[PDB]
Amino acid sequence: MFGKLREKLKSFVKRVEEEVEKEEEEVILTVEIKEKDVDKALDELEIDLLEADVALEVVDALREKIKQKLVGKKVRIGGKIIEEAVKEAVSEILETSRRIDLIEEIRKAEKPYVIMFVGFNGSGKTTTIAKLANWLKNHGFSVVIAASDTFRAGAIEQLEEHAKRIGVKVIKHSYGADPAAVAYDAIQHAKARGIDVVLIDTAGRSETNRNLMDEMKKIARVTKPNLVIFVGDALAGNAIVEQARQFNEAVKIDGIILTKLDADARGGAALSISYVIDAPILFVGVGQGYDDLRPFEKEWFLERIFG
Ligand SMILES: Nc1nc2c(ncn2[C@@H]2O[C@H](COP(=O)(O)OP(=O)(O)O)[C@@H](O)[C@H]2O)c(=O)[nH]1
Ligand SMILES: Nc1nc2c(ncn2[C@@H]2O[C@H](COP(=O)(O)OP(=O)(O)O)[C@@H](O)[C@H]2O)c(=O)[nH]1
């Protein structure tokens, strides 16, 4: 997992590690990292990362932060240190404008808390909504799901079977109905039951009459979501970022859930998407089980591309 990312960063380290070693050689208790050393290794890194599927802007940012961290620092003659700076850079690129803490922004929030999901078909949206509902239930929160994917045959029943498993109520209409009205209903429902949170499952493809971005706009306006979450399939690579970009201009994205990390041998998008969109990754999907969802933390990520 994130193997490719891990190996290209490890390659860069040992490479700078070699050209310092050489000065150690032309040798004075300490040694300094110079540009010449980095610039070249950095140039290789660029090409490596761009092959691991990291977005251009993120490779340019990493390069800046890595160079700054390395050039000038003195070392002792006779790895851990160089990797430290790289690790720092990665952390910082994973940092976002804002932070979100879900459990605390709901306890605080005036109920019901409305979360709207957006994403292209096959990204794990419905599954992810089922996982989050179960997660919020496990932490003392009452939740209900809106079946607003109304034009894809079977999606309502597909969601119904997910929600039975986890024992969550699904508010729906029927096939052919108005996606926004279903969600409006689910919200009105929760106001009356005094339910903590509503989650909205949404369409993932364009229809004869429709355009998906138009549809998400419509729903967003009717529902006034407290939070908009983009769901993207890690395996899809940089395509994930261009997808989020599209959704972000129709309806602003507040948070991200990436799925299928269990099968992501690359990691380039997971590293780049939070920076490109300026929204935090809140959870990651790591399987098809309803508990295969994990609150995201920089440490869990770094712990996976380094040690
Ligand atoms: N391996 C793996 N598969 C996942 C994960 N999340 C979703 N899936 C699978 O992706 C497929 C499509 O998911 P679905 O929720 O129907 O996607 P949707 O079209 O975006 O709603 C299903 O087979 C899910 O089991 C994950 O974290 N890991
Ligand atoms: N689609 C749908 N909407 C519901 C359901 N239950 C409640 N609602 C919404 O909740 C609103 C009223 O909530 P409620 O206190 O149960 O009853 P009411 O005030 O007499 O309508 C209705 O206008 C519905 O839009 C439901 O099972 N399905």
Numbering used by the authors: 1 to 27, 36 to 86, 90 to 318
List sentences quoted exactly from the publication behind this structure.
The process is mediated by evolutionarily related signal recognition particles (SRPs) and their cognate membrane-associated receptors (SRs also called FtsYs in Bacteria and Archaea). The core proteins of SRPs and SRs are GTPases that each contain a structurally and functionally conserved NG domain where the G domain adopts a ras-like fold responsible for GTP binding and the N-domain adopts a four α-helix bundle fold. Here we describe the X-ray structures and solution conformations of FtsY, the SR from the hyper-thermophilic archaeon Pyrococcus furiosus (Pfu), in its free and GDP•magnesium-bound forms. The low resolution, solution scattering data complements our high-resolution crystallographic analysis and shows that the crystallographic structure and the average conformation adopted in solution are similar. While the overall architecture of the archeal receptor resembles its previously described bacterial homologues from the SRP/SR GTPases family, the structure of Pfu-FtsY reveals novel features: The elongated N domain lacks the N-terminal extension observed in all other bacterial FtsYs and is instead characterized by a long N-terminal helix αN1 that packs against the NG core in a different way; sequence analysis suggests that archeal receptors may cluster apart from their bacterial homologues.
We tried to co-crystallize Pfu-FtsY in presence of GTP. Although SRP-GTPases, especially the SR subgroup, are distinguished by their low intrinsic GTPase activity and nucleotide specificity, the crystal structure we obtained showed the presence of GDP•magnesium bound in the catalytic site suggesting that nucleotide hydrolysis took place during the course of crystallization. Identical crystals could be obtained in presence of GDP but not in presence of non-hydrolyzable GTP analogs. The resulting structure was solved at 2.0Å resolution by molecular replacement using the apo structure as template. The previously reported Taq-FtsY•GDP structure was obtained with a receptor that lacked the first 20 aminoacids and contained no magnesium, which is required for the association between FtsY and Ffh.. The structure reveals two nucleotide molecules, one in the catalytic site and one located at the surface of the protein next to the IBD motif unique to all SRP-GTPases. The refined occupancies of 100% (catalytic GDP) and 69% (external GDP) and atomic displacement factors of the two GDPs are indicated. The GDP•magnesium bound receptor adopts a conformation close to the one observed in the Taq-FtsY•Ffh complex. Our FtsY structure identified a second and distinct external nucleotide-binding site located on the surface of the receptor.
